[PDB]
Amino acid sequence: ADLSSRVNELHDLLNQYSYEYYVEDNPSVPDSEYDKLLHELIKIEEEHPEYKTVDSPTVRVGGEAQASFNKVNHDTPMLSLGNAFNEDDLRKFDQRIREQIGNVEYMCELKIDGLAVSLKYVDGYFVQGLTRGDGTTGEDITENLKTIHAIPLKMKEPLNVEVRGEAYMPRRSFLRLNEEKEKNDEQLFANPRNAAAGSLRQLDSKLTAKRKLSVFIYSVNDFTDFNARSQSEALDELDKLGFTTNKNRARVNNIDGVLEYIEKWTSQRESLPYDIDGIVIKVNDLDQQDEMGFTQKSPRWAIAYKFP
Numbered sequence: 001a002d003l004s005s006r007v008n009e010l011h012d013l014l015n016q017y018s019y020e021y022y023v024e025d026n027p028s029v030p031d032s033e034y035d036k037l038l039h040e041l042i043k044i045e046e047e048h049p050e051y052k053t054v055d056s057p058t059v060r061v062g063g064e065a066q067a068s069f070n071k072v073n074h075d076t077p078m079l080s081l082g083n084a085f086n087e088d089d090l091r092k093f094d095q096r097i098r099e100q101i102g103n104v105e106y107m108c109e110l111k112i113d114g115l116a117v118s119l120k121y122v123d124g125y126f127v128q129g130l131t132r133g134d135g136t137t138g139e140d141i142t143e144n145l146k147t148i149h150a151i152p153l154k155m156k157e158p159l160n161v162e163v164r165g166e167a168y169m170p171r172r173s174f175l176r177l178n179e180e181k182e183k184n185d186e187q188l189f190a191n192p193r194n195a196a197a198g199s200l201r202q203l204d205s206k207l208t209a210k211r212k213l214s215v216f217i218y219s220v221n222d223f224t225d226f227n228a229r230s231q232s233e234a235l236d237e238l239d240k241l242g243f244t245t246n247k248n249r250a251r252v253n254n255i256d257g258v259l260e261y262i263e264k265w266t267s268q269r270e271s272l273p274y275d276i277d278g279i280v281i282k283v284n285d286l287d288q289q290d291e292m293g294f295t296q297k298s299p300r301w302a303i304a305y306k307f308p
């Protein structure tokens with residue numbers, strides 16, 4: 001039967017609703033509506049499997065295909081950040097930069113206590129999701145990562161990029177998960193990060209699907225097809241491309257602003273719906289980052305402040 005009108009309409013609505021619920025946290029429709037439409041599409045695809053697509057909303061429920069866990073090199077190795085533990089560390093960081101390249105703007109972001117991941121897009125389609133591993137070689141968990149609504153299955157523009165993000169379990173879902181384990185005398189997860197790890201390490205993407213995971217994307221391997229001239233522009237651009245980014249980022253003019261940001265988030269981190277382990281500070285301008293270069297191990301243009 002030619003079901004293309006209804007299939008397309010279901011794709012449109014479920015994509016809208018998923019984005020509203022999981023990326024914006026702003027539903028327009030009750031869960032009963034989402035569930036109803038998803039169920040209808042699932043039945044359409046069961047009875048008319050020619051309508052299945054690689055980026056169908058039904059992908060989010062997981063499938064029979066198992067994540068290979070194969071060792072796979074990232075297109076581009078993921079960076080390792082140096083750490084800061086106090087103000088003096090940050091003043092040193094700032095001083096090294098300003099002595100070499102002049103005064104800079106800084107991008108400040110929350111360091112999500114998650115599983116670092118790389119998400120590879122080809123022609124705008126999500127085609128590979130790897131754990132960070134050793135920074136060069138990770139494990140292929142693509143099939144599990146596809147169940148996370150916050151990871152777009154298809155971007156707004158058909159780019160070939162490898163984005164970098166942190167996958168995580170929101171705290172309240174972690175806690176309610178542990179309530180469920182307590183009721184069934186199971187060993188509780190130690191924390192949200194361990195729960196996210198356990199969930200992504202399943203062989204069964206259908207289990208991963210029912211766990212409440214999300215992501216925040218913080219960079220990309222290659223800026224060639226980005227118009228961004230800065231990290232802050234780049235994140236805005238990722239937003240416009242369809243990715244999930246952290247809205248608590250801020251551009252600050254100087255190291256005083258950086259300290260202010262850390263002072264703010266030290267007090268407010270308690271109220272966030274996910275765990276963070278620090279604050280990442282980057283020279284904002286992309287050309288300036290390039291100018292600062294890398295040590296043998298780490299960017300000279302970025303630092304991870306770690307909470308006590």
Ligand SMILES: Clc1cncc(-c2nc[nH]n2)n1
Pocket residue numbers: 079080081109110111112218219280302
């Ligand atoms: Cl380059 C890098 C490495 N690890 C984390 C981050 C990050 N995390 C949040 N924003 N940026 N960036």
